[PDB]
């Protein structure tokens, strides 16, 4: 399995490397963790490796970082870009978690995980202003104040 590493591993090398390894290793251990990527294309593999490396470096957190993000979760109003019909007051399409987290990227700063976003508690597809909360800690969770771009 020709794949491009993302992190450092025993007897393979370091991040960014290119290795031909055993198929099951790459099948079961690395590739389903987001720790590697198939080598199918030059620029496709290059871009994926670069972006995945940046995101893996930037995704980390600790318990105390959660205790601090529990305070920093009361950010300013992070707005969301929308294409919908304002005719009746219903939205065409549901809006991603990437969109919310990239809005936080370009307004507040923290580039969080789409996973922990309680978007279900947002209940998008009703035109208004949805609240939000996120599994920051085991026990501690803080809240964000939000608004929507009228369509």
């Amino acid at each position: 399995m020709k794949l491009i590493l993302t992190a450092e591993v025993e007897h393979l090398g370091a991040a960014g490397d290119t290795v031909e390894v055993k198929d099951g290793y790459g099948r079961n251990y690395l590739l389903p963790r987001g720790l590697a990527i198939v080598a199918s294309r030059g620029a496709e593999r290059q871009a994926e490796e670069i972006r995945r490396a940046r995101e893996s470096k930037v995704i980390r957190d600790i318990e105390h970082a959660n205790e601090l993000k529990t305070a920093l979760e009361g950010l300013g109003d992070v707005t969301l870009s929308v294409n919908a019909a304002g005719d009746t007051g219903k939205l065409f399409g549901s809006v991603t978690a990437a969109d919310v987290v990239n809005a936080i990227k370009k307004a507040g700063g923290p580039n969080l995980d789409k996973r922990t976003v309680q978007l279900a508690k947002a209940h998008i597809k009703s035109v208004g202003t949805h609240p939000v909360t996120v599994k920051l800690h085991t026990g501690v969770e803080a809240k964000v104040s939000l608004n929507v771009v009228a369509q």
């Binding site: 198929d23 099948r27 198939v38 996973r115």
Partner: protein, 77 residues
Amino acid sequence: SAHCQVTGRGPGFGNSVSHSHRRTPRRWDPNIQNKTYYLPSEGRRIRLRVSAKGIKVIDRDGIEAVVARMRARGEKY
């Protein structure tokens, strides 16, 4: 069997042998297994009945692709 799911590599029915024949089949099964996988899209673990061949197909083709191809066939996965 429960039948394959990604390709449709069903059985076959052989027959005779060497050392004088005797006429007599022996199904040539396919090699299905019970490997599981993970759908990052919908956040879920799926178990399938897939041959090693089909695993090959997956790892050089994706899983989303495969479930869409199976949705076509409307297998009750």
